[PDB]
Every structure is written in C-alpha cells, then in structure tokens.
Design a protein around this ligand. Structure first.
Ligand SMILES: CCC(=O)O[C@@H]1[C@@H](OC(=O)CC)[C@@H](O)O[C@H](COS(N)(=O)=O)[C@H]1OC(=O)CC
Ligand SMILES: [Zn+2]
Length: 257
C-alpha cells in the first residue's frame, strides 16, 4: 500500500487516491508576506484541562497518543472555528536530518518535525462522519526545531522503546498535552486536507507561528522507530512527511500582524 519510500511515496498516492490532486490539499507553504491579518478572527481557545490520554501506538506510518473523546474533555474552539472540536489524538512527522521533517513550510523553511493535534467537530457525532465534511476536522500544527530539550515531550520519548515496530501499542495515561504548546498562540489558518491517504478535504488547518524547541537527543529517539513490523528487516521511521502542495484558489489568514 502507501508509504514514504521511492516506490510508494507521495508522488504515487494520486493513483489510488485521485483527490491527491484536488482543490484543497495539504500541507502548503505559508508565504508570510501573502497571508492576510484578519481582525475578525476570535481568540483561539485551547481547553485541555480534563484531557484523558489512553495509549500510544505505532501504526507503521507514525505514532499517535490517543485520547478519550467520548465527552468534551479536551477541546479546541475559537479562531476561525465555529462550534466545538474534540481532541482525538496527536502525532508527529519528522525527518532524517534536522533540516527537514515538517509538512508545512514557512517561506519555504523546513523544520525538523511537526506536531499535529487532531480534533473533530462534535456536530458530526463521530470522527468517521466528520472526515466526510468540509469543516469536519481542526488540526493544530506546531513546528519543532532542534535546540534545548522540551520537558513536556520527554514522557513520550521515554516510551518509544516499547513501541518500536508497526502495530505495537503501550498504555499512556495521565499525559498532559498542554506541555507541548509554545507560549504564543499566534497562528496562520487555511482550509485543507489530511496529509496522508485518504487525503480527505475536511480540515481547517491552524498552524502556530512559534515553534517549540526539542533536543537533538529527543529527535534522535524519534528516528529509532521502525516502519516495519517485528521480525522484519529494519526500515527506520524517518521522513514521514508529505511535501508542500499547490495553494490553488485559497487564502491563508493570520491571527496577528
Ligand atoms: C489512527 C489515526 C491515524 O492513523 O492517524 C494518522 C497519523 O498517524 C498516526 O497518528 C499514527 C498512529 C498520520 O499518518 O497522519 C495522518 C494524517 O493526519 S494529518 N497529518 O492530516 O493530521 C493521520 O490520519 C488520520 O488521522 C485519518 C485516517
Ligand atoms: Zn499529521
């Protein structure tokens, strides 16, 4: 099936998933001098106080930390968003080298990794229904640069040894996603898509301007994960990012000047 290698990577996805060449694909390059400040945007509201993490899973494409989304325990509201969006999981995309790994770019700059906190619009009842709607998901994206260690990320790093290969999961309760946010919630926003198959065009992207810093030791541990399953030849999980796609008929709005 699909992946990030030469023979199954992003250049190939359009054959099984023709929407890959669609009207509102993600990621994109964020040209900071083309985005328009929108003073009508309301303040972004990240409400993660009652967040309940459950488990961490390597699915052969990335790893995610899952959350109990059976109630409004951890939600994103405000900004360009109408209504309430519930946190279902977060995951990362990263590179083989510190100079690449993010999906979105900023004035063509690539970051070492990108964190995606995925939320679904509660008006649609469940995640599966939400992805079939043009306003079904809100994904909060945070760039990672290599610098000083991020204490709030270490508990995630600590557990990667236990989910090295495809299909492995481990208990991951009592994790606080608030520890992964930068100080500022300044952001750019645009309508886009999931960045992996099925590439559905159901996402309002909210990408924060301020990156978080993580240590080289922390990112190195991301790079020891495996795309392959247990007992198979080792393929390091690296460069699991889709490159920037054409902006086409879309406008990126900024929450700040
Ligand atoms: C089980 C959840 C899932 O596979 O998440 C997917 C995620 O992987 C991880 O979370 C590792 C387990 C990853 O490849 O990113 C895409 C793309 O998400 S993104 N980058 O657009 O935010 C997600 O795809 C989806 O969320 C929809 C199927
Ligand atoms: Zn993602």
């Amino acid at each position: 099936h699909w992946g990030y290698g030469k023979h199954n990577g992003p250049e190939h996805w359009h054959k099984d998933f023709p929407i890959a060449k669609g009207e509102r694909q993600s990621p994109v390059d964020i040209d900071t001098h083309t985005a328009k400040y929108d003073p009508s945007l309301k303040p972004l509201s990240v409400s993660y106080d009652q967040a309940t993490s459950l488990r961490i899973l390597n699915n052969g494409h990335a790893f995610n930390v899952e959350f109990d989304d059976s109630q409004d325990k951890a939600v994103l509201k405000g900004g360009p968003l109408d209504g309430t969006y519930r946190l279902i999981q977060f995951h990362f995309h990263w590179g083989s080298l510190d100079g690449q790994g993010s999906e979105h770019t900023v004035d063509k700059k690539k970051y070492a990794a990108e964190l995606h906190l995925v939320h679904w619009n509660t008006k649609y009842g469940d995640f599966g229904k939400a992805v079939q709607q043009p306003d079904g998901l809100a994904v909060l994206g945070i760039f990672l640069k290599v610098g000083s260690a991020k204490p709030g990320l270490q508990k995630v790093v600590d557990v990667l040894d236990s989910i090295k290969t495809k299909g492995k999961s481990a208990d991951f309760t009592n994790f606080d996603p608030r520890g992964l946010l930068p100080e500022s919630l300044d952001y750019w926003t645009y309508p886009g898509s999931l960045t992996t198959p099925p590439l559905l065009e159901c996402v309002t992207w909210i990408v924060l301007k301020e990156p978080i810093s993580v240590s080289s030791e922390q990112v190195l541990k991301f790079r020891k994960l495996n795309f392959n399953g247990e007992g198979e030849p080792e393929e390091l999980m690296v460069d699991n990012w889709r490159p920037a796609q054409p902006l086409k008929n879309r406008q990126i709005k900024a929450s700040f000047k």
